[PDB]
Design a protein around this ligand. Structure first.
Ligand SMILES: NC(=O)C1=CN([C@@H]2O[C@H](COP(=O)(O)OP(=O)(O)OC[C@H]3O[C@@H](n4cnc5c(N)ncnc54)[C@H](O)[C@@H]3O)[C@@H](O)[C@H]2O)C=CC1
Ligand SMILES: NC(=O)C1=CN([C@@H]2O[C@H](COP(=O)(O)OP(=O)(O)OC[C@H]3O[C@@H](n4cnc5c(N)ncnc54)[C@H](O)[C@@H]3O)[C@@H](O)[C@H]2O)C=CC1
Ligand SMILES: NC(=O)C1=CN([C@@H]2O[C@H](COP(=O)(O)OP(=O)(O)OC[C@H]3O[C@@H](n4cnc5c(N)ncnc54)[C@H](O)[C@@H]3O)[C@@H](O)[C@H]2O)C=CC1
Ligand SMILES: NC(=O)C1=CN([C@@H]2O[C@H](COP(=O)(O)OP(=O)(O)OC[C@H]3O[C@@H](n4cnc5c(N)ncnc54)[C@H](O)[C@@H]3O)[C@@H](O)[C@H]2O)C=CC1
Ligand SMILES: NC(=O)C1=CN([C@@H]2O[C@H](COP(=O)(O)OP(=O)(O)OC[C@H]3O[C@@H](n4cnc5c(N)ncnc54)[C@H](O)[C@@H]3O)[C@@H](O)[C@H]2O)C=CC1
Ligand SMILES: NC(=O)C1=CN([C@@H]2O[C@H](COP(=O)(O)OP(=O)(O)OC[C@H]3O[C@@H](n4cnc5c(N)ncnc54)[C@H](O)[C@@H]3O)[C@@H](O)[C@H]2O)C=CC1
Ligand SMILES: Nc1nc2c(ncn2[C@@H]2O[C@H](COP(=O)(O)OP(=O)(O)OP(=O)(O)O)[C@@H](O)[C@H]2O)c(=O)[nH]1
Ligand SMILES: Nc1nc2c(ncn2[C@@H]2O[C@H](COP(=O)(O)OP(=O)(O)OP(=O)(O)O)[C@@H](O)[C@H]2O)c(=O)[nH]1
Ligand SMILES: Nc1nc2c(ncn2[C@@H]2O[C@H](COP(=O)(O)OP(=O)(O)OP(=O)(O)O)[C@@H](O)[C@H]2O)c(=O)[nH]1
Lengths: 497, 497, 497
């Protein structure tokens, strides 16, 4: 059980088309024959599936010891029905076009599941950042954008890179600075070419913790749904149950704190080295220190090394957040859990899905969970496309206008019950007192994220009941994804051909 | 014996580097240590070898029956040491990135062997032109350029497509018209984006027969070299020996006539269907009719069907001009020939080379033979970059000036020997009478091609003696190729890295 | 005597306008009043004089020890009557806008004196290349072009940098590579943005020795003019007289060999360290070795150190070729020479000119001598703007056509005097045998340079007699310069204002 990662995501898309194909002909309003309309649907589905562009590079670089190397680099743009196309830049010696093509596809559907205006994209670099000088990573990241930009694969109108595995705000700043100063110098939207930038360079409050909140608001939108918890046989709530984490990195890290702050007791955590198992809870603050002190989660003196993979650890909510294809046909029989959230991108093989549906354990699709990161990188790309600190124009104004609603209510009452002259004191609460001056930059993020992953969780529930998919929310997700991208191709007069 | 076609061309490049690496350190003038300089050479060689860009596409098209299809299309730009990058566009259901990457590499060396200012490139389309309407091929060719152009892979400053397998002047006109009218409208060099265009659209006299002349002037430059014919045991001349042809298409066709007009008796010819064997000669005119009348070289009533592949036919000069990897370890033992010219691109597997060197049969590298086609498509790209019919400015002027050289000589003599008054009539010959008005468009082609493949044949001879490569002219060719591309990287300060 | 270098060149321009102003009104064909026309001339002269653009920069760089620095950099575009604008890039800690503005002006007149289509320009960088790593010079040169390019000061349509003091073909390659790969990627004329590139990167045979030939053909065009040598009291010829050199660098070096190969005995040479005086001749080959071996012309065991400046050395032809303002009011009284050539740019202060005219010693203007370098960098900018090795198209053709002139003459004679049947053998000479195949790349250089500095030397002689300027050829040069740039402004309808 190790399919070509692109043949796998295609496999999910397949079961999606196998169910939509019927409810999609009846919504096609053209005037043709029944079979003809189906010969129209299946055709458009064959256009969605493949990637529309897969660039492939090679970089002469000069390492600090003067020697040269080549660096294969990739970038796919899955679909063009929606511009621009976002997608992270991954640094790993395990990246390939067969991987990038699929990760590129997912973000075409992630962005469709959470209603974000972007096509899919993804860029890889065969590289191990743990090997190279922090000068060499600059000469590599800047060259990698110099190559893309001149071939039309970076720019606020075509593609927007983003952080991903083994990349952070450090790299994303090198990109925005190279693009702004070479190609899009005159363009007013220069700095808006990448997301995940540092705050001082045009970022957004909580771009790092963005994905974590995703995993959080996702789990919350289901744990607090009794219709499934009655099936899974658990309790709506967090402090009553626990969870584990694969891949203590950005997702895994912030998936903890936001899920740790509400009573859910993070049992264990692991990484490429080993596992750290404590059935009583690990402080996400303290462990975060060792990643900056001891280089690994190992040695953590408030837990122990675990002779076994996290995926088999007894818990309540499994969260693979480290790499692809981790759960598989050989790990599925030994999960011993109830819910498998997904921070990583397609961490479950399609073979293991049936086993999970068979074992009666709910799998929440990665299309829905790690989509939080996108919906915040959208606010960033949209922040620095308007050139204004959101809400700055109307801080002093909203603060005044609200002080005149409450006043008018007061002045109005002091004429009806004011016969005694009694000063009715209409004053804000503690909560409203914060929201007087309006929506600050952080407020729309903590809301626009919690809202985007509210509508999405419904549209997934609303579908899985319409088609009776039970706990295969994944298939229900692709259905909502495919139905949306279809109406774009259908009405667009797909081509000039 | 069926290597990955890119692992094969790499294999030739390897044996090339294995011999140049020594004579190239001593020509490196930097001030370092011996071993260091070698750590500099091997590094640059690792930069040349791989392709710098390999795009990959997917086309929604609307066939005439209304159904949709996807069409994978590829384009590689091997190197950027020389802009623009030329390369044909092949239509075949057997094309892939693993093929295009190598064909792209060859033209980086072809252009280096014949001193033509272009990097290498190649574009493929998984398609069978024998299946589609001549309307659908337009909707495909125009879309294929629309996709490339917007991503910076067509344009007189980056890439210049050209005819290749299953494409002719018909297709190349659709490209130039689409590019000129969409992307490079304002650009003055719009129409110069492709070569192989029809004459009325900016072509060159004999762009079709260009490659054939290549195969001709190549063979001639060796047959008339006794130093090898003494080794091979044959006679310098054409009317005394024969030859066969694989792949009666453009190369194979015009390889015949230009080699048929000088006594060399074309024994047989074949194609995807079958062989046409006559040990007494086939009229290239008559057979050309059946390709336009009977759809195949079969049925040709002045010869017979041959129960066997051409590659084993007894002859004097074998010319594979149909596809890749035709000669191989299984066909090498049964060649029964003396010289194997190469119209096709890498039609010989590296394993068969040793057998050919062992059997003491000279193999002329495809780098040298089919390079004629490029050297004429260069004159085209250079014709329509100057916007003038070459030589038009000075037709009436040269005609006059020459009539004053010959006159002055006459008037000068009629004063020394003119004591008798005898009118010395200095008048042109028959030959010069043609070259009076200067160099017309066709004259520079028939010369610039015959000249370009004169210098090249020497530099190959001049190398194969300097390093004692005997009859492995192929290896001698790559040596001249690598030495040239190296001096470009070496001196360029290869990167800003 | 140390004027602001821009107030000095202005001073020469002044005496130029003071003489042209009369002979220029009568050539103005507009219909106005006499005084009005003069109010038109003086006005246009005030437009020529100043620089139209003087950029000024500042570079954050990261030295190899990690520390930051700023690097002031300048570039002036004197005039725009002729695009593009060429001008070297000088690296020296003595550069400033007050210097660049004037050097920029000179090349507007240099290019006008030798009829080369370029406005003037010049770029400086406050830097000492002897201090920085050969990595740091790359990070500086590439950044310096990145800054200019984005502000429209590099590009084959606006400006074309070139080598100058403390820069060579090494730097010019870093520029062409940075521009080609960032800004003008798509442009077909990308690599044509700079001149002085290495040959493998699009240079010209003898771009280094180009300026030297200038100094040579300049001196020759005057030494072989008796009209002045009768005044100066010397002999037309080189082997009969000697010369010295200031600044053994590129100009001074190649000024020697080309003037050494014709009997002229180079007495001494100096540099920032000291002088090397031998009244019997210094081998330019041997001394060139020590510059690559012993770091200085000092220690040269076939001469001695000279306790004195070159400018006072007894010789016949003084050539300052090291820096500006070297001759001055304090050095003029002690020249003890006959002719002062000028390789450097304005090495003579205007005060010293009168003393030189008074001492009756001819000063050849730098406008005329070092203009050879430009006229070759023009051929380069024009070479790589046509994308063809000049003369390659018609090597085999001219070789044939000439073999038919000589044949026709033979065949013609063998009918008049051929009654005896005697085979008249019309065959090329030794000299013509070289020029059969036509004009190669090096031939047009050695001619186009020797020709350009033939017409120029006449137009200067032709003027200095028309206005009776005696030996002040400098003033005669500016007259020809001003008269040319004037007709451009005059007829252009100078502005839309
Ligand atoms: N971080 C983000 O912004 C987003 C991340 N994701 C997904 O989340 C996943 C992880 O988040 P990242 O930020 O990339 O984390 P990261 O870049 O910090 O690295 C993940 C960590 O997991 C560990 N790990 C990797 N492979 C492993 C394996 N096979 N077994 C055990 N441990 C392993 C590594 O030590 C690494 O520290 C990624 O796969 C990515 O697809 C998705 C969207 C946004
Ligand atoms: N290089 C570029 O073109 C960049 C442009 N921007 C744009 O600027 C806008 C800034 O808004 P926000 O940062 O959200 O407001 P903000 O109130 O969130 O500002 C964040 C930080 O930026 C600093 N800052 C504000 N103005 C500054 C200035 N003129 N110079 C230096 N630092 C300054 C503030 O001290 C604050 O600490 C964004 O909308 C973005 O579109 C932002 C970053 C880089
Ligand atoms: N035609 C040109 O302008 C140039 C052609 N070439 C090379 O020359 C070769 C042929 O020239 P094209 O113009 O492409 O010919 P073409 O495009 O006319 O087609 C080649 C012919 O050979 C036959 N053929 C193909 N594969 C065969 C096989 N496996 N066995 C037997 N017959 C087969 C086909 O029937 C076809 O008619 C190509 O492989 C190409 O690489 C190289 C440079 C320029
Ligand atoms: N669409 C475009 O931008 C094109 C531009 N050109 C440029 O035009 C130049 C033409 O030179 P050549 O064709 O080599 O000269 P040529 O003497 O070879 O002309 C070839 C054919 O073009 C025809 N032709 C010439 N001028 C014409 C016009 N104004 N309208 C219609 N047909 C005309 C002539 O009748 C002749 O049959 C080329 O240098 C090329 O650069 C050529 C083709 C297309
Ligand atoms: N080299 C060229 O391509 C061109 C040069 N020029 C002029 O020729 C002059 C020299 O040619 P470059 O190529 O710049 O030579 P360069 O760049 O090799 O350096 C000139 C040499 O003269 C010596 N020198 C500098 N200042 C001196 C001083 N005050 N006293 C004694 N020696 C000194 C230095 O040691 C240096 O090696 C320059 O001033 C420039 O204006 C003009 C046009 C083209
Ligand atoms: N990066 C760019 O865009 C460059 C473009 N060019 C253009 O190319 C033309 C070249 O003409 P010339 O060099 O004067 O001819 P040339 O006969 O003077 O060639 C000089 C050297 O270039 C080498 N060379 C020729 N073709 C080559 C190729 N395809 N690959 C690698 N090396 C090759 C030759 O071996 C020779 O040693 C120039 O007209 C120039 O416009 C030249 C240099 C760089
Ligand atoms: N690595 C790390 N990041 C943190 C930590 N605390 C907060 N952050 C991030 O830094 C941002 C600033 O935190 P706050 O000032 O508390 O604002 P906030 O959005 O209310 O913080 P949260 O509600 O915890 O998301 C937060 O949005 C988090 O994304 C922490 O302890 N460790
Ligand atoms: N298919 C085909 N093409 C031909 C034939 N004859 C000539 N051509 C091509 O058409 C062009 C015009 O031919 P010509 O008028 O004879 O000029 P040419 O260049 O002297 O012809 P060649 O010397 O045979 O190359 C030639 O350059 C050939 O490329 C032919 O019989 N069949
Ligand atoms: N530094 C240096 N350069 C040289 C020397 N000899 C020639 N060159 C340069 O290298 C080029 C190649 O020289 P040649 O092969 O002799 O061609 P060339 O143009 O006839 O040489 P010259 O007539 O001396 O200019 C010349 O154009 C010179 O510019 C030399 O001895 N030292």
């Amino acid at each position: 059980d190790d399919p070509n990662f692109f043949k796998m995501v295609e496999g999910f898309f397949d079961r999606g088309a196998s169910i939509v194909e019927d409810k999609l002909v009846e919504d096609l309003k053209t005037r043709e024959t029944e079979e003809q309309k189906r010969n129209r649907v299946r055709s458009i589905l064959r256009i969605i599936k493949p990637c529309n562009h897969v660039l492939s590079l090679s970089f002469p670089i000069r390492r600090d010891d003067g020697s040269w190397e080549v660096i294969e680099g990739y970038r796919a743009q899955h679909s063009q029905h929606r511009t621009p196309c976002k997608g992270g830049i991954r640094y790993s010696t395990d990246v390939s076009v067969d991987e990038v093509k699929a990760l590129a596809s997912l973000m075409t559907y992630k962005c469709a599941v959470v209603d974000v205006p972007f096509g899919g994209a993804k860029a890889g670099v065969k590289i191990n950042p743990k090997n190279y000088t922090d000068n060499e990573l600059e000469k590599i990241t800047r060259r990698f954008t110099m190559e893309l930009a001149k071939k039309g694969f970076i720019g606020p109108g075509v593609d927007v890179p983003a952080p991903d595995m083994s990349t952070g705000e450090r790299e994303m700043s090198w990109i925005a600075d190279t693009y702004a100063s070479t190609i899009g110098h005159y363009d007013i939207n220069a700095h808006a070419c990448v997301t995940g930038k540092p705050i001082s360079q045009g970022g957004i409050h909580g771009r790092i913790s963005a994905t974590g909140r995703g995993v959080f608001h996702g789990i919350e939108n289901f744990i607090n749904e009794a219709s499934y918890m009655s099936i899974l046989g658990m309790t709506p709530g967090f402090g009553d149950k626990t969870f584990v984490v694969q891949g203590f990195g950005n997702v895994g890290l912030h998936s903890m704190r936001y899920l740790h702050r509400f009573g859910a007791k993070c049992i264990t955590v692991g990484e490429s080295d080993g596992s750290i198992w404590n059935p009583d809870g690990i402080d996400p603050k303290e462990l975060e220190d060792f990643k900056l002190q001891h280089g690994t989660i190992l040695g953590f003196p408030k837990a122990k090394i675990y002779e076994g993979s996290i995926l088999e650890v007894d818990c309540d909510i499994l969260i693979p957040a480290a790499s692809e294809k981790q759960l598989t046909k050989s790990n599925a029989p030994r999960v011993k859990a109830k819910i498998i959230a997904e921070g990583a991108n397609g961490p479950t093989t399609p073979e293991a899905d049936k086993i999970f549906l068979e074992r009666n354990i709910m799998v929440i699709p990665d299309l829905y969970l790690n989509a939080g990161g996108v919906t915040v990188s959208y606010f960033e790309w949209l922040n620095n496309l308007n050139h204004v600190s959101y809400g700055r124009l109307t801080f002093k104004y909203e603060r005044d206008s609200n002080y005149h609603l409450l006043m008018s209510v007061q002045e109005s009452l002091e004429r009806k019950f004011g016969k005694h002259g009694g000063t009715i004191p209409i004053v804000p609460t503690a909560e409203f007192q914060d929201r007087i001056s309006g929506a600050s930059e952080k407020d729309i993020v903590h809301s626009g994220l919690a809202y985007t992953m509210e509508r999405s969780a419904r549209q997934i529930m609303r579908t899985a009941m319409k088609y009776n998919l039970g706990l295969d929310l994944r298939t229900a997700a692709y259905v909502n994804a495919i139905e949306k991208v279809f109406r774009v191709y259908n009405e667009a007069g797909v081509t000039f051909t």
